[PDB]
């Protein structure tokens, strides 16, 4: 690939048997930003300023990822964007936008957030890269690598030389490949907007196939509360040790990522008869804008986040997850096939999706793993 043969990544097809970095840590780093096409400037977005936050919301709302057949588009909310872009340790320089000099109109963005990453037998401070977005009018004008080189440089200045990020496209070289599955909650609407299709099988039959219980079955299931944060953290850390690519979150990061926020993140813990929290389920909120459908604008989708089981069965936990999403007005519940999610996808009547999700590490040489060994859910 013309751009990635220049980057510290392994090649497609070279199989790897060493573990470690590709290029050394930088003893000196460029002081000047990379050059942008004439008429555009860099700007670090202050998301605390609501106007800038709004601007960033609009850029993504009009120009971010669409589905395979260009019928749906992500609609990350502002509050969702603040949760995803301002976790503990965030830096305003890592919210790197590109503007039109004349009008100051925002036409580009890319972000990095710090994250301790565990891969095989190594823990290293890395960054997660997300929301690479180029205004539609500025596509294939070679701006995306400029964004990538600039974010890489700004991360380099803070002393971090490894990264993790995902993509729907095959790049050099996936550390793992996952697959999205989608569970219908309101099959009527999903089918009405062409998100899914009747498997001849009558819709009335299809409507009663995806019907759920009116209430969750697990005992002592309740929303996560402040007093749960240490025990959630404990549960997550021990559970994540079976996978090979995981986050290592401090108790502070667990507060940020799991404490419930309406319309962003939902967490439910299981407190048993002894009062001990033994399992938890979580899912975040991300609707998609449905394009050119007059009466159907946005589909409310729940995305599974991190679900840990030590006494409740994973199946029952995820069943109650489906129930809770349903009660909240979600049309569909999405899950990848990573960690142990293969063990319950069909049985809860999810169907497989058409999009893949490739995981990538920047400047880190290691063997690839199967989806079941992936233990990282990015925003």
């Amino acid at each position: 690939y013309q751009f990635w043969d220049t980057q510290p990544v392994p090649k497609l097809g070279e199989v790897v048997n060493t573990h470690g970095p590709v290029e050394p840590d930088k003893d000196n780093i460029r002081q000047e930003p990379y050059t942008l096409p004439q008429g555009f400037t860099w700007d670090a977005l202050d998301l605390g300023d609501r106007g800038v936050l709004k601007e960033l919301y609009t850029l993504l709302n009009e120009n971010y990822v669409e589905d395979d057949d260009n019928m749906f588009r992500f609609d990350y909310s502002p509050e969702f964007l603040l949760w995803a872009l301002r976790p503990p340790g965030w830096l305003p320089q890592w919210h790197c936008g590109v503007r039109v000099v004349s009008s100051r109109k925002l036409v580009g963005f890319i972000s990095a957030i710090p994250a301790n990453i565990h891969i095989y037998d190594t823990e290293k401070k890395m960054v997660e890269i997300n929301f690479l977005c180029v205004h539609k009018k500025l596509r294939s004008k070679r701006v995306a690598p400029v964004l990538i080189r600039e974010i890489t440089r700004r991360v380099h200045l803070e002393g971090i030389f490894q990264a993790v990020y995902t993509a729907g496209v095959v790049l050099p070289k996936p550390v793992g490949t996952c697959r999205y599955w989608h569970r219908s909650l309101n099959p009527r609407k999903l089918i009405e907007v062409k998100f899914s299709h009747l498997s001849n099988m009558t819709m009335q039959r299809t409507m009663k196939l995806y019907r759920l219980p009116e209430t969750p079955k697990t005992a002592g299931l309740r929303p996560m509360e402040t007093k749960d944060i240490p025990v959630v953290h404990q549960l997550l850390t021990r559970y994540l040790k079976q996978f090979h690519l995981t986050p290592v979150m401090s108790q502070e990061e667990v507060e940020h990522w799991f404490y419930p926020q309406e319309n962003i993140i939902d967490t439910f813990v299981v407190e048993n008869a002894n009062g001990e929290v033994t399992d938890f389920l979580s899912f975040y909120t991300l609707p998609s804008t449905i394009m050119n459908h007059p009466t159907h604008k946005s589909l409310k989708a729940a995305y599974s986040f991190y679900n840990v089981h030590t006494q409740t069965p994973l199946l029952d936990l995820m069943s109650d997850a489906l129930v809770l999403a349903k009660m909240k007005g979600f049309d569909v519940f999405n899950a990848l096939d990573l960690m142990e999610n293969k063990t319950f996808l069909e049985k809860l009547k999810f169907g497989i999706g058409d999009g893949n999700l490739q995981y990538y590490l920047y400047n880190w040489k290691c063997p690839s793993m199967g989806a079941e060994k992936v233990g990282l859910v990015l925003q």
């Binding site: 990822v65 749906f72 588009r73 992500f74 729907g168 999706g353 058409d354 999700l357």
Partner: peptide, 7 residues
């Protein structure tokens, strides 16, 4: 990141 749908 990937806006997948039913296949």
């Amino acid at each position: 990141k990937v806006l997948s749908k039913i296949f």
